[PDB]
Each structure stands twice: as C-alpha cells, then as structure tokens.
C-alpha cells in the first residue's frame, strides 16, 4: 500500500495502469465486524386488522389443469407472438 513509490511505478508501468486506486486485497474500507443490532421489518399481512387466511390461499387457490379438449371458419394461431429482434447495445454494440 507498505510498498514504496519506486516499486509502485514499476508495478504501474509494467501493467500499464495505476493500481493504488484499487487493489486485490482489502483494507480499512471494510465494514467493522461488530455492526449494530438490526430491526428487521414485519410482514405485509402482519396487521391484526382484517387478515383472514381466506383471502391469501396460494396453496389452496391452485386449480387442477383446465379441461379444453378430451378424447372422451378456423384461424391460424401461435403459442405466443414471435420474438422481437432486440437492437444492438447502446453503450457498446461492437466489442
């Protein structure tokens, strides 16, 4: 960091870039390992007002597959609209 300036020019010149700006290892910048206690939020349906499970029944609201045709003038359709050709990159199209 420890490293004297003459070494730093050698590293900077050989790699063609400045490295003291950002280094592979860590330093004092990291958050201290004794962060204050948190106060985690509550659930959206944590209210003690109207909160009946009769409303949210994700497991129970599931329905067996819908019967559409069973063994026991027309149009032509596709399972979805054909995909759209996305444009090139705006920041850098040709790398």
């Amino acid at each position: 960091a420890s490293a004297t300036r003459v070494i730093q020019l050698l590293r900077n010149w050989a790699s063609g870039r400045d490295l003291q700006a950002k280094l592979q290892l860590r330093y004092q910048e990291i958050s201290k390992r004794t962060q204050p206690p948190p106060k985690l939020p509550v659930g959206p349906s944590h209210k003690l007002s109207n909160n009946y499970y009769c409303t949210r029944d994700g497991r129970r609201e599931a329905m067996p597959p819908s019967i559409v045709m069973s063994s026991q003038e027309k149009k032509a359709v596709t399972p979805a609209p054909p995909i759209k050709r996305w444009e090139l990159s705006k920041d850098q199209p040709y790398l």
Partner: protein, 115 residues
C-alpha cells in the same frame, strides 16, 4: 434488398444472394404437395392459410430488408430454411395421415393425476 449482407450472424447458416425467388418457389412447392392431402384435412387448411398469405407480399414486396418484418421470423436466409422444414413436414405427414380417430383410447384411467 440492398447490399448483400456479409454474414447472418449464425455460423453454419450462409447468406443466399437470391432469397426472394427461392422463398417463392418453396412456397409454391408446399402448396403443390398440399394438393395431395384431401380438402377436409385441418393441417392442409392451416398451411394453405399461411402459405399463400405469406407468398403474397414476397411476390409483391421485393425488398428482403422489409421482408424481415413482413414475416416477423428473423432473417430471410433462415426463413427459407424454415420453409424447407415445412416442406419436410408436408412430405412427412403425407405418410402420417392423422385424420383418423385415435388409434387407441387411453387404457382406463392411466391419466388423472394424482393417483
């Protein structure tokens, strides 16, 4: 149309320099082989619907660059490849002939999950 684009961006698939008429002669061919399959067939009605309709502007509009969004199916050089695939299907289901009823009804309740 315009200048012949160098590559399609998909290796293996090359650029056809005369694409509009190749797409034409393909579309007639599938119309031709579709003559064999009788009228009541649904597959015939489906592709007799999208062939001539898609044969329409490729006959009328000659610019393949505009033909990209006429078919909304990507580059023309693989649209003809897809057209070939449709021709392969016409040959294939001319054997399959699935217009008969089911070969077999499903044995008892082999379906109906859960058990």
């Amino acid at each position: 149309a315009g200048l012949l684009k160098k590559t399609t961006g998909l290796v293996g698939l090359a650029v056809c320099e005369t694409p509009h008429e190749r797409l034409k002669i393909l579309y007639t061919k599938i119309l031709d082989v579709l003559g064999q399959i009788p009228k009541n067939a649904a597959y015939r009605k489906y592709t007799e619907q999208i062939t001539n309709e898609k044969l329409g502007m490729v006959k009328a509009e000659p610019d393949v660059k505009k033909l990209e969004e006429q078919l909304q199916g990507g580059q023309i050089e693989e649209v003809i490849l897809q057209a070939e695939n449709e021709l392969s299907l016409a040959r294939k289901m001319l054997r399959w002939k699935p217009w008969e009823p089911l070969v077999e009804e499903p044995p008892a309740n082999q379906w109906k999950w859960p058990i």
